[PDB]
Amino acid sequence: HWIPVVAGFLRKDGKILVGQRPENNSLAGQWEFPGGKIENGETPEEALARELNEELGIEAEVGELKLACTHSYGDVGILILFYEILYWKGEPRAKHHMMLEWIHPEELKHRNIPEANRKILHKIYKALGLE
């Protein structure tokens, strides 16, 4: 089976937004880009706009598709679509995550990130125009 997921790159003076997953979460304490699952009927952009509102309290315009990655957890596949988010109203707040931080994208390496995300870190850097 496959699970499609969307994630947004929001930037602030070169830095990028990450959220720390809340207590008793599947990846409690690990740092990720905001986003979530695509629901039946939704375009990936519709899903991401919804998730950014639900997670961050912002109304975001979804920009260009930058990257798609797969990972496997046994017989289940995850397909993640990463979009550039250039424009939004409001400032992100930790409605879902236990903390939000704006980090230098080079920082991602040394952060406590999901094991599955580290494996695609080089593609993320390339998509973000790095190294």
Residues in the annotated binding site: 21, 25, 32-35, 37, 39, 51, 54-55, 117
Site string for a second copy, 42-61 (x = CB under 8 A): xxx-----------------
Site for a second copy in 63-82 (CB under 8 A): 65-70, 72, 75-77, 79, 81
Quote the radius of gyration of the chain (alpha carbons, Å). 14
28, 104 in Cβ contact below 8 A? no
Q: How far is CA 112 from CA 32, 79, 94, 107, in A?
A: 9, 21, 18, 10
Instruction: Give residue 100's identity as a one-letter amino acid code.
Output: L
Shortest distance, position 124 Cβ to a second copy, whole Å: 13
Residue (of 7, 67, 56) closest to 35 by Cα position: 7
Among 13, 41, 110, 112, binds a second copy (CB under 8 A): 41
Instruction: Write the DSSP symbol of residue 14.
Output: T
47-73 core/surface letters (b: 16 or more CB in 10 A; e: else): bbbbbbeebbebebebbeebbebeeee
Nearest CB to a second copy, comparing residues 44 and 114: 44
Q: Does 118 bind a second copy (CB under 8 A)?
A: no
Q: Does 121 bind a second copy (CB under 8 A)?
A: no
Among 12, 28, 37, 109, binds a second copy (CB under 8 A): 37
Residues of this chain that bind a second copy (CB under 8 A) = 1-4, 37-38, 40-44, 65-70, 72, 75-77, 79, 81
